[PDB]
Amino acid sequence: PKKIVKDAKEKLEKLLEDAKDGGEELALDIAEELAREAEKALKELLREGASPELIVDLAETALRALLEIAKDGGEELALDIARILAKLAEVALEVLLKDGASPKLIVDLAKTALRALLEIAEDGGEELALDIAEILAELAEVALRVLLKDGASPKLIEDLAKTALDALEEIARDGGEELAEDIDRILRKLEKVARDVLRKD
Amino acid sequence: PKKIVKDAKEKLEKLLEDAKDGGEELALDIAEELAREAEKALKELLREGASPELIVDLAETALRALLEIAKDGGEELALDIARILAKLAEVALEVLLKDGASPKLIVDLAKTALRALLEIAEDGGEELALDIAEILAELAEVALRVLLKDGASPKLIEDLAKTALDALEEIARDGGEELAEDIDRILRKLEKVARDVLR
Predict the structure, then answer these.
(1) Which of B96, B153, B160 best probes binding to A when mutated, by most A CB atoms within 10 angstroms?
(2) Between B49, B99, B152, which is nearest A1 by CB?
(3) Which ranges in chain B belong to alpha helices (H)?
(4) CB contact under 8 A, B151 and A153
(5) How many CB pairs under 8 A join A and B?
(6) Local structure of residue B66 (DSSP, 8 states)
(7) What contacts 24+ positions apart, CB below 8 Å, involve A182-191?
(8) What is the DSSP letter of B155?
(9) Which of A128, A165, A176, B56 has the fewest C-beta atoms lying within 10 Å of its C-beta?
(10) In sequence order, what are the residues at sequence separation of 6 or more whose Cβ sits closer than 8 angstroms to the Cβ of residue B29?
(11) From CA A37, how far away is CA A31, in angstroms rounded?
(12) Cβ within 8 Å, pair A100-B102
């Protein structure tokens, strides 16, 4: 429980200290080891009956640790970290659903992961921004369907949807016309998914 | 978390074995000691960061333990256990809301408690039935408002409302005409409560 979280954050901080300003090829291996250590600790918290708030805490700590590795590195590494970050965010959201988490805690973790991806796209170039926008939209769809399965209200589902739609618009503001319509098609698909999830609710 | 539940259930079972068919007057004190021990363990699970499923398990175990004391006793004791059972269920529902539980788990615990009260009105007189229904309607309102605070959907909220309204109609069935209109006044007040929460 509380003992599992302390051991996990200690391993994450030590993993984060390594390969940070120490090599791109090593940072990718360290990040995959950081994401695996987080995934095992999340599954461990689920087995031992931990609160959803502890699960959110450990998950957010891991996502921010991956975020720091992606920023100070190249765009090739940033896309690799963002794919790892979104996959870890999926596992954490699935764990919260199995642990019986509230809609609000699912929204919090989802927003933390969406802002982290947005933080990578704004810092990078235009081709990277489109790659992050597609990753962000897929993760947003996963979170919206997790909220639906958890019993969330249309208010919170529409809330998480707007945050993801705003994040996609925020990427297009600092881009050319070619990037705008490449994000506009992503926005229409995410609005379609959000409309379907809300109609079932 | 898992360590707290095992110690609590062992205390509840031993407390239940005592005064089960064992004196009524002691059973009421044992039941108050039973609900007090469960309420302290539920607060303990919240402080140590326990999962909502562990809180539901311990709460349902305590509610059923009270249910056993109420059935093999008299109607006066059955009403006393039902008030204790409803108060404990309210604490457990609030603990679930503070712990970050899902709306489904809140609905599950609420239904367990509403059925436990209905089972006490079962095989009881009409005077006890009306007293149980008033307790059931109040606990139903508590659970519905907790569901709203937890971000529950209209489907889950309307589902819990249907269960509570159906439970009131089951009490009216096989009852006197004087009991039916007494339940009918309770049904209409729970209906507007559900409409206000659903809006």
Answers:
(1) B153
(2) B49
(3) 2-17, 25-47, 52-71, 75-99, 103-121, 126-149, 154-172, 177-198
(4) yes
(5) 88
(6) H
(7) A182/A130, A182/A133, A183/A130, A183/A133, A186/A133, A186/A134, A186/A137, A189/A137, A190/A137, A190/A140, A190/A141, A190/A161, A190/A164, A190/A165, A191/A161, A191/A165
(8) H
(9) A176
(10) B19
(11) 10
(12) yes
Q: What residues have CB less than 8 Å from A79, skipping those under 6 apart?
A: A128, A131, A132
Using CB atoms, which residue from A53, A101, A102 is nearest to B49?
Answer: A53
Choose from A2, A51, A98, A155 for mutation: most chain B CBs within 10 A: A51
Q: Kindly report the nearest CA distance between residue A151 and chain B, in angstroms.
A: 6
b/e per residue, B59-73, with b = 16+ CB within 10 A? bbbbbebbbebbeeb
Best A102, A155, A156 residue to mutate vs chain B (most B CBs within 10 Å) = A102
| Residue pointed to by tokens 């469960």 | B38
Encoded tokens for B137: 């309607």
Domain that holds residue A115: 2-199
Query: Of B126, B136, B140, nearest to B172 (Cα)?
Result: B126
* Structure tokens belonging to residue B142: 């508590």
Domain total in chain A: 1
